[PDB]
Write a protein that binds this ligand. Structure first.
Ligand SMILES: *[C@@H]1O[C@H](CO)[C@@H](O[C@@H]2O[C@H](CO)[C@@H](O[C@H]3O[C@H](CO)[C@@H](O)[C@H](O)[C@@H]3O)[C@H](O)[C@H]2NC(C)=O)[C@H](O)[C@H]1NC(C)=O
Ligand SMILES: *[C@@H]1O[C@H](CO)[C@@H](O[C@@H]2O[C@H](CO)[C@@H](O[C@H]3O[C@H](CO)[C@@H](O)[C@H](O)[C@@H]3O)[C@H](O)[C@H]2NC(C)=O)[C@H](O)[C@H]1NC(C)=O
Ligand SMILES: *[C@@H]1O[C@H](CO)[C@@H](O[C@@H]2O[C@H](CO)[C@@H](O[C@H]3O[C@H](CO)[C@@H](O)[C@H](O)[C@@H]3O)[C@H](O)[C@H]2NC(C)=O)[C@H](O)[C@H]1NC(C)=O
Ligand SMILES: *[C@@H]1O[C@H](CO[C@@H]2O[C@@H](C)[C@@H](O)[C@@H](O)[C@@H]2O)[C@@H](O[C@@H]2O[C@H](CO)[C@@H](O)[C@H](O)[C@H]2NC(C)=O)[C@H](O)[C@H]1NC(C)=O
Ligand SMILES: *[C@@H]1O[C@H](CO)[C@@H](O[C@@H]2O[C@H](CO)[C@@H](O)[C@H](O)[C@H]2NC(C)=O)[C@H](O)[C@H]1NC(C)=O
Ligand SMILES: *[C@@H]1O[C@H](CO)[C@@H](O[C@@H]2O[C@H](CO)[C@@H](O)[C@H](O)[C@H]2NC(C)=O)[C@H](O)[C@H]1NC(C)=O
Ligand SMILES: CC(=O)N[C@@H]1[C@@H](O)[C@H](O)[C@@H](CO)O[C@H]1O
Ligand SMILES: *[C@@H]1O[C@H](CO)[C@@H](O)[C@H](O)[C@H]1NC(C)=O
Ligand SMILES: *[C@@H]1O[C@H](CO)[C@@H](O)[C@H](O)[C@H]1NC(C)=O
Ligand SMILES: *[C@@H]1O[C@H](CO)[C@@H](O)[C@H](O)[C@H]1NC(C)=O
Lengths: 339, 40, 240, 47
């Protein structure tokens, strides 16, 4: 649905704390403002993507305290109150698969004052003017929107998509859904205990799959890894000479006078500015893939959660009954239910 | 008396749906609504 | 329904006449192309490390071979400025293709048809949509049925009448608390539960939450009217 | 049955049509009224 927000301070990356480098960087005009502007555009687009995917309800539905859903057991996809960040049991399994690499939260400088700072690349990225920024919605707010989409679905079916939420008994909602796939509604009621057992068992296999394998969330870890790799690559270009006498800016400025130094600093500026324009091009092209995935995820939220889809293989493989959204780090998971 | 406030954003108005194993809500009336969608 | 459509088209005049921000998606695309060309022009005023930005000042003050080193920096920096502008415009043009393909898909599925897709053609059940031109864009006036004034009813998955269990053919069973009816699911319009509204399968043991009610069979009064006709005619025909 | 099916045309045009009966639920509901109606005339002929 989204990728990490990054902002890169062009002066601190290119000219880190030198004024006589900054006075050369000014001679290249607008390029640092273009880079900041482009990265700010990407960063705002990540909140927009998350808003288009999850904020499809302007109203926050609560599930009832009674759980008479006709034998269907949503307790593994509804919230668990007993844990402080209010996610469901499957959302906690999802949240543990994708190991993040910063989220912008309060990296308060004294962490970067020790052996800790040497073992991690987050302090090196930070010290070279590369900063991750936090998403607007916390994982609490994504879990609340997801809980409202799910509580709307199990209490009111598709109706909260089109207007006010209208309650219906869950086994009668499944009857409307069976007629939707062209199966006559008596086929649900005469099998309701078996349909509930097959659903409850299938949600059980989702836990057993997500709890066992390391690889199930690969599409989300690939997005985290590409962001972290592009920042690590951008940090490592600060070790290139670009044909200057040294890669370290202060060595040039201590070893050469104002005339011969500016011939060397200009190479570092040229190579580093080319490294940022490369990174921001990779990030703008990537952001268009993450957007295309977010607009698809919003379209699956609308057509698979807020409705029932006649579109073959759009909402999982089978005839679509309904889907349940689950939050994941930088993504959404849909549990598609199919006859 | 005007100033900048800072707050945790509201996700939406809260609503417990009146669910039961034998209750249905059915609309006695409709609103025909026209909504604008703009695309480049 | 006509008065509500005419009133809702009235709110479209008033909203577009009143607010500035409604066409932001189009004005932002004009602002991005305008800002990108303004940047590409401002960027000509850079030195890129040459003794001037103005190409003619270099050629006014330097000879044929000392000038080349100044001119080539301006070439390098300006060529990098175009390669940046054209890369930005190619990436944007992909966002404008995606928007045009979405707009073409909404023209086909919301104007040339009616869409079962939820929220694709506006928020509600889609009836129809009307396209309108805009600068560099399209506006769709989507028309939706939105259900408005709900009442609660007691409900059942089936009616039991004769050991046989009955289900709606279309619609849902409801009770006002004293009587049972069948209604279309998206508009309250109650009808007497009959063998024309319902179909039978199985028996009343299997359906969880089935309720007892009579089911009317409209062939019965057509045979009972025909029975009392016959009984009176037999009593008459015992009289002569 | 005549409630599960609809008629159109005749057996010659449809490739692969098969002969089978189609039950009409109106028919026993009037044939029961027929044998009872014959009984009702038989009672009225008896005295
Ligand atoms: C549930 O819906 C029922 C149908 O609308 C309704 O039953 C109907 O109640 C009205 C009175 O409110 C009766 O009206 C008739 O009453 C006598 C009949 O002799 C006449 O003097 C009147 O002119 C009028 O025709 C209906 O006969 C009656 N219908 C049936 C099938 O019994 C219930 O009252 C509703 N219950 C609730 C709780 O709202
Ligand atoms: C729906 O209508 C049904 C028919 O009127 C009704 O079924 C009848 O229910 C009673 C009570 O359960 C049964 O009573 C007999 O049951 C056993 C013997 O089999 C004894 O323990 C009892 O003393 C008594 O003799 C009837 O046998 C039963 N009849 C049929 C045809 O099943 C349902 O109870 C009604 N249900 C509701 C919810 O209204
Ligand atoms: C489906 O049912 C049809 C009605 O029973 C049946 O049609 C009848 O088929 C017989 C045998 O082919 C024909 O027999 C007569 O045909 C001519 C006179 O028309 C003579 O040469 C024969 O000696 C004989 O009298 C009938 O003409 C025909 N009747 C009708 C109304 O079409 C079909 O054959 C059955 N088909 C199958 C595959 O079951
Ligand atoms: C549909 O019914 C619900 C709840 O059931 C009713 O609760 C009482 C009011 C009483 O009439 C019972 O016999 C019913 O079973 C209604 O929900 C209430 O809504 C009001 C605000 O409108 C709120 O103050 C209450 O706390 C709600 N109660 C619950 C349990 O949610 C609902 O209003 C009814 N729908 C309509 C359209 O009227
Ligand atoms: C819904 O599913 C949950 C989880 O599969 C069931 O919870 C288990 O219930 C048994 C019996 O009380 C306990 O021994 C287990 O420790 C529970 N496990 C968990 C993870 O909570 C729950 O019983 C099911 N609900 C219904 C109504 O059947
Ligand atoms: C359905 O809702 C409409 C409004 O959309 C109701 O129409 C209004 O009726 C009141 C009187 O009851 C009038 O004061 C309004 O001017 C009407 N508005 C319009 C647009 O005509 C209508 O009465 C409702 N119908 C039912 C059966 O409840
Ligand atoms: C022997 C016999 O058939 N008796 C019946 C009698 O029971 C019935 O009341 C009457 C009605 O007309 O018809 C005769
Ligand atoms: C609805 O819930 C109540 C309380 O659990 C129960 O007594 C009743 O039998 C249920 N109704 C149906 C139709 O199962
Ligand atoms: C009574 O029956 C005779 C036939 O037997 C019929 O002609 C006559 O019109 C009938 N009268 C009435 C009042 O039905
Ligand atoms: C179907 O195929 C068989 C040969 O396998 C042939 O005898 C028969 O006439 C065909 N029937 C139709 C309706 O095409």
């Amino acid at each position: 649905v989204s990728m990490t927000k990054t902002s890169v301070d062009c002066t601190m990356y290119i000219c880190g704390d030198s004024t006589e480098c900054s006075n050369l960087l000014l001679q290249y005009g607008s390029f640092c403002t273009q880079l900041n502007r482009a990265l700010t555009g990407i960063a705002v687009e990540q909140d927009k993507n998350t808003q288009e995917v999850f904020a499809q309800v302007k109203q926050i539905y609560k599930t009832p305290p009674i759980k008479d859903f006709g034998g269907f057991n949503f307790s593994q996809i509804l919230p668990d109150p007993s844990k402080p960040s209010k996610r469901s049991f499957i959302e906690d399994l999802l949240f543990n698969k994708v190991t993040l690499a910063d989220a912008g939260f309060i990296k308060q400088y004294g962490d970067c004052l020790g052996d800790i700072a040497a073992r991690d690349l987050i302090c090196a990225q930070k010290f070279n003017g590369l900063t991750v920024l936090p998403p607007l919605l916390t994982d609490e707010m994504i879990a609340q929107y997801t809980s409202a989409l799910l509580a709307g679905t199990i209490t009111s079916g598709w109706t909260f998509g089109a207007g006010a939420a209208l309650q219906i008994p869950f086994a009668m909602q499944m009857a409307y859904r069976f007629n939707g796939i062209g199966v006559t509604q008596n086929v649900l009621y005469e099998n309701q205990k078996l349909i509930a057992n097959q659903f409850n068992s299938a949600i059980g296999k989702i836990q057993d799959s997500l709890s066992s394998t390391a690889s199930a969330l690969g599409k989300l870890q690939d997005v985290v890894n590409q962001n972290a790799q592009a920042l690590n690559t951008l940090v490592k270009q600060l070790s290139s000479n670009f044909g200057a006498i040294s890669s370290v800016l202060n060595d040039i400025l201590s070893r050469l006078d104002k005339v011969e130094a500016e011939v060397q600093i200009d190479r570092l500026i040229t190579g580093r500015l080319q490294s940022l324009q490369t990174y921001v091009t990779q990030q703008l092209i990537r952001a268009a893939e993450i957007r295309a995935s977010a607009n698809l995820a919003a379209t699956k939220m609308s057509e698979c959660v807020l409705g029932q889809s006649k579109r073959v293989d759009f909402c999982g493989k089978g005839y679509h009954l309904m889907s349940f959204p689950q939050s994941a780090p930088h993504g959404v998971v849909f549990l598609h239910v199919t006859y | 008396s005007q100033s900048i406030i800072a707050y945790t954003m509201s996700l939406g108005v809260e609503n417990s749906v009146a669910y039961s194993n034998n209750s249905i809500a059915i609309p006695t009336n409709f609103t025909i609504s026209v909504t604008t969608e703009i695309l480049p | 329904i006509a008065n509500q459509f005419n009133s809702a088209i009235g709110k479209i005049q008033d909203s577009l006449s009143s607010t500035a921000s409604a066409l932001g998606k189009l004005q932002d695309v004009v602002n991005q192309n305008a800002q990108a060309l303004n940047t590409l022009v401002k960027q000509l005023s850079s030195n890129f490390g040459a003794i001037s930005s103005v190409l003619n000042d270099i050629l006014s003050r330097l000879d044929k071979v000392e000038a080349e080193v100044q001119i080539d920096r301006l070439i390098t920096g300006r060529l990098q400025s175009l390669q940046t502008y054209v890369t930005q415009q190619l990436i944007r043009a992909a966002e404008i293709r995606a928007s045009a393909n979405l707009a073409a898909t909404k023209m086909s599925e919301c104007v040339l048809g009616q869409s079962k897709r939820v929220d694709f053609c506006g928020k509600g059940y889609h009836l129809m949509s009307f396209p309108q031109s805009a600068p560099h864009g399209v506006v769709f006036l989507h028309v939706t049925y939105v259900p408005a004034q709900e009442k609660n009813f007691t409900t059942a998955p089936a009616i039991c009448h004769d050991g046989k269990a009955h289900f709606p053919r279309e619609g849902v069973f409801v009770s006002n608390g004293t009587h049972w009816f069948v209604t279309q699911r998206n508009f309250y319009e109650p009808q007497i539960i009959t063998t024309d509204n319902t179909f039978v399968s199985g028996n009343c043991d299997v359906v969880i939450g089935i309720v007892n009610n009579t089911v009317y069979d409209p062939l019965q009064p057509e045979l009972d009217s025909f029975k009392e006709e016959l009984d009176k005619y037999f009593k008459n025909h015992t009289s002569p």
